[PDB]
Design an enzyme around this catalytic site. Structure first.
Site, short mmCIF file in Angstrom:
data_model
loop_
_atom_site.label_atom_id
_atom_site.label_comp_id
_atom_site.label_asym_id
_atom_site.label_seq_id
_atom_site.Cartn_x
_atom_site.Cartn_y
_atom_site.Cartn_z
N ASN C 77 -9.76 5.60 67.08
CA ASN C 77 -10.85 6.12 66.28
C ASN C 77 -10.70 5.88 64.78
O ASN C 77 -11.63 6.19 64.03
CB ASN C 77 -11.03 7.62 66.53
CG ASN C 77 -11.52 7.92 67.93
OD1 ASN C 77 -10.93 8.73 68.65
ND2 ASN C 77 -12.60 7.26 68.33
N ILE C 84 -11.71 6.91 58.95
CA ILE C 84 -11.84 7.74 60.14
C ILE C 84 -13.27 7.68 60.64
O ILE C 84 -14.22 7.82 59.86
CB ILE C 84 -11.42 9.19 59.83
CG1 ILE C 84 -10.12 9.20 59.01
CG2 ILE C 84 -11.25 9.98 61.11
CD1 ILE C 84 -9.61 10.58 58.70
N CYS C 85 -13.43 7.46 61.94
CA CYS C 85 -14.76 7.30 62.53
C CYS C 85 -15.24 8.57 63.20
O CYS C 85 -15.82 8.55 64.29
CB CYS C 85 -14.77 6.12 63.50
SG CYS C 85 -14.52 4.55 62.64
N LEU C 86 -14.98 9.71 62.57
CA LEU C 86 -15.79 10.89 62.81
C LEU C 86 -17.23 10.58 62.43
O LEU C 86 -17.49 9.93 61.41
CB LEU C 86 -15.28 12.08 61.99
CG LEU C 86 -14.22 13.04 62.51
CD1 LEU C 86 -13.12 12.29 63.22
CD2 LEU C 86 -13.64 13.84 61.35
N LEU C 119 -14.59 3.39 68.01
CA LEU C 119 -14.75 2.39 66.97
C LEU C 119 -13.63 1.37 66.93
O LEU C 119 -13.85 0.24 66.49
CB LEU C 119 -14.87 3.05 65.59
#
Lengths: 74, 374, 148
Positions: C77, C84-86, C119
Site C-alpha cells: 500500500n 501512502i495510498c490511504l 496500489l
C-alpha cells in the site's frame, strides 16, 4: 441542450441529455435515475481520464455526441 | 421450500460462476475492455508481446463490485427483464424510525426487497465572496457562500439556493470575519469559541444558520444499494431474509456468498435485521452508526474495521426500500436459462474450468481487437 | 498565520501521542511533522523504525495532509516514493478527520496491509500470491532500512 452517450463493459449504451455546464455529479445522478446505480460507485471515463466530482462537463472538453465509459470495478 | 430452492440456486450459481451469470458472452467483454484499455498499452517496441501484458493485467472477467450493478443483476434474475423494469418504476419508501413499515410490507410470500441508502452530502466548507466575484459554474460546488447582502448555498448541481438571510445579518457576518485564513474555511470547527471574539461568534452563528437551513434541503445522494430475498415459510417465527450485496471497492456478490454472510445475517431474524437497519438511519452516535454499518455491509470477517478510524460514518444515513413479489418458477427458469447458456457456450466437467475457459475466450477476443487496431 | 486548530491539534497530540507513533514539529516550517512509527508487534515490520514526513497544506483542514514514508518499506500500500495510498489523502478527506486519525490509519495499515485492491505493483501481486515470502521480504526490508 446536448446529447451524450455512456457505454459500459456489459455492452449497454445509455443516452443522457445534459449541458456543458452540468457538473459530473449531475451526470451521475442522471445515470442513477436511468440505471439505479448509486453515484458514489460510478467511475466516468472520457478520453482515458477520470471525471472528478467537483468539476463540470466543460472542464473536460465534453461536447455533443461524445461517448463516456461507465467503469463499475474499483 | 421452493423459494428456498430459488435462494439456494442463485447463491450456488453466483458462487460458482461470478460474472458469467450476467449471460454476456466473453467476446463482448474482451472487445469492450480492449476498446477502453488501449491507451494503457506501451506505444513502442514489440507491442504484441507488450499487449500480452495488458491482456494479462485485465480483470474484465472478475465480477463487478458495484453494489448497484449487483442489485440490478439480482433483480434481472429474479423478475425477468420485464418484472425488473416494472420494479424500476416503483417508488422507494423511506424507512420509518422503528422500521415498522418495512415489516408491514412483508407478507408471507416470496418477496424481493431493494434497498437504496443515502448519505447526507451537506456542505462542509464556507467562503466569503463578493457578488462580482461569484460565478456559479466555475465556483466550488456544495459550498456555502457568504456575501455582504446574501448567504447562499451552491449545491451539487450548481444551483444557487438562498438561505433566507437579510442584507443586515449578512453584512454583519461578512464584516465580522476579518482573519485572512477564515475567508475560505470550514463550517463546523470544534476549536472555535463564539464568546472568545466577535469573529468566532460570527462563524458560529453562520454555522448554526447553515445547520438549521440544511435541515430541509435535499442533500441526500445515494451511497449504497443491496437486495433482500425473503422466501415464504411454514410459520412466522421461522421465516428469514437473505441480504444480497456487493460493495464498492471491497467485495463482489460472489465473495459475499462465499463467506455465507447472507446466512449470518439471516440468523438475525427479520425483526433483528430490520431493527438494526432502522437504527442505522435514526441514530446520531457516529460510532454506533459505524458499528451497525460494519455489521450489516462489510465483507465477512471485516465487520470490526470496516467503519473505524478514517471510514467512520459521520454523515447521517437514510434507508429506502421497495418491495415486490417473486414467482419462484420465473426465477428458477431464468437461472436455468443462464445455466444452459453457460454449459452450452463454455463447457466443462466443473464450473471452475468453465470460468477459466470463459476467461480465455475473453482474453483472446481482447487480444484480437487490440491487434487488429494497432 | 497558523490557525488555532493546527496549534491546538499539536498541543493535544503532544499531550496525547499514539503509542509507537512519535509526531513532533520542526521550526523552519511548523506545518512539518517528523513523525516516526516503529513496526508494531507481530508484524513483519516489527523491530524497525520508519521515519515519515507529515506536511500540513495551507488548505488544511479542507485539504488532506500529505504523508510520505521516508524509509523504504515492503508493503502493498506504499509505493517506492513512500506515498501512502490511504484514500484519505485524495478523496474521502473531511474536516471531521484529524492528524491523529491519519496516523492511526497509517499504523493500522502497517499492522494490516490490503493487497487485493491496492496500489503497489509486484509487491501486491506477490502478497496475494505468496503471503509467506512477501511477509519475509518485508522482514528483510525492515532489518535493512528501519533498524538504523
Amino acid at each position: 441542450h446536448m446529447q451524450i452517450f455512456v457505454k459500459t463493459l456489459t455492452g449497454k449504451t445509455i443516452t443522457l441529455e445534459v449541458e456543458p455546464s452540468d457538473t459530473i455529479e449531475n451526470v451521475k445522478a442522471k445515470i442513477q435515475d436511468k440505471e439505479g446505480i448509486p453515484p458514489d460507485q460510478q467511475r466516468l471515463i472520457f478520453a482515458g481520464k477520470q471525471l472528478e466530482d467537483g468539476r463540470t462537463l466543460s472542464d473536460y472538453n465534453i461536447q455533443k455526441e461524445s461517448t463516456l465509459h461507465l467503469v463499475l470495478r474499483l | 421450500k421452493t423459494g428456498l430452492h430459488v435462494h439456494e440456486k442463485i447463491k450456488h450459481m453466483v458462487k460458482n460462476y461470478g460474472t458469467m451469470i450476467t449471460g454476456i458472452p466473453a467476446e463482448i467483454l474482451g472487445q469492450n475492455e480492449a476498446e477502453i484499455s488501449v491507451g494503457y498499452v506501451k506505444k513502442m517496441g514489440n507491442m504484441k508481446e507488450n499487449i500480452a501484458e495488458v491482456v494479462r493485467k485485465s480483470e474484465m472477467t472478475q465480477p463487478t463490485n458495484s453494489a448497484g450493478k449487483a442489485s440490478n443483476e439480482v433483480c434481472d434474475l429474479l423478475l425477468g427483464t420485464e418484472g425488473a423494469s416494472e420494479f424500476e418504476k416503483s417508488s422507494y419508501q423511506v424507512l420509518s424510525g422503528d422500521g415498522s413499515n418495512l415489516k408491514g410490507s412483508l407478507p408471507n410470500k416470496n418477496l424481493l426487497v431493494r434497498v437504496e441508502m443515502d448519505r447526507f452530502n451537506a456542505p462542509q466548507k464556507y467562503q466569503k465572496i463578493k457578488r462580482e466575484e461569484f460565478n456559479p459554474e466555475t465556483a466550488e460546488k456544495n459550498k456555502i457562500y457568504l456575501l455582504e447582502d446574501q448567504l447562499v448555498y451552491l449545491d451539487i448541481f450548481g444551483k444557487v439556493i438562498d438561505l433566507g438571510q437579510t442584507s443586515d445579518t449578512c453584512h454583519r457576518l461578512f464584516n465580522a470575519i476579518t482573519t485572512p485564513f477564515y475567508q475560505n474555511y470550514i463550517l463546523y470547527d470544534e476549536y472555535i469559541d463564539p464568546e472568545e471574539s466577535a469573529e468566532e461568534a460570527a462563524m458560529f452563528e453562520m454555522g448554526e444558520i447553515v445547520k438549521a437551513k440544511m435541515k430541509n434541503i435535499d442533500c441526500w445522494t445515494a451511497t449504497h444499494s443491496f437486495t433482500i430475498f425473503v422466501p415464504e415459510s411454514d410459520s412466522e417465527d421461522t421465516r428469514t431474509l437473505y441480504p444480497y450485496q456487493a460493495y464498492w471497492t471491497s467485495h463482489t456478490l460472489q465473495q459475499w456468498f462465499s463467506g455465507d454472510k447472507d446466512e449470518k445475517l439471516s440468523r438475525l431474524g427479520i425483526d433483528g435485521y430490520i431493527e438494526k437497519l432502522a437504527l442505522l438511519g435514526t441514530t446520531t452516535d457516529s460510532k454506533i452508526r459505524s458499528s451497525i454499518y460494519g455489521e450489516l455491509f462489510s465483507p465477512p470477517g471485516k465487520e470490526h474495521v470496516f467503519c473505524t478510524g478514517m471510514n467512520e460514518k459521520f454523515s447521517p444515513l437514510r434507508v429506502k426500500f421497495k418491495v415486490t413479489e417473486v414467482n419462484p418458477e420465473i426465477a428458477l427458469q431464468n437461472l436455468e436459462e443462464v445455466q444452459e447458456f453457460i454449459d452450452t457456450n463454455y463447457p466443462g466437467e466443473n464450473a471452475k474450468d468453465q470460468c477459466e475457459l470463459y476467461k480465455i475466450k475473453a482474453q483472446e477476443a481482447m487480444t484480437k481487437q487490440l491487434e487488429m487496431r494497432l | 498565520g497558523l490557525p488555532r486548530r493546527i496549534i491546538k491539534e499539536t498541543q493535544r497530540l503532544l499531550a496525547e501521542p499514539v503509542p509507537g507513533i512519535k509526531a513532533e514539529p520542526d521550526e523552519s516550517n511548523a506545518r512539518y511533522f517528523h513523525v516516526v512509527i516503529a513496526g508494531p508487534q507481530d508484524s513483519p515490520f516489527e523491530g524497525g523504525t520508519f521515519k515519515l514526513e507529515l506536511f500540513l497544506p495551507e488548505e488544511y483542514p479542507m485539504a488532506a495532509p500529505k504523508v510520505r514514508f521516508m524509509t523504504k518499506i515492503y508493503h502493498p500500500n506504499v509505493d517506492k516514493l513512500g506515498r501512502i495510498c490511504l484514500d484519505i489523502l485524495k478523496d474521502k478527506w473531511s474536516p471531521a478527520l484529524q492528524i491523529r486519525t491519519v496516523l492511526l490509519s497509517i499504523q493500522a495499515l502497517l499492522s494490516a496491509p490490503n493487497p487485493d485492491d491496492p496500489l503497489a505493483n509486484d509487491v501486491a501481486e506477490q502478497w496475494k500470491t505468496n503471503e509467506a515470502q512477501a511477509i519475509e521480504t518485508a522482514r528483510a526490508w525492515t532489518r535493512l532500512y528501519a533498524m538504523n
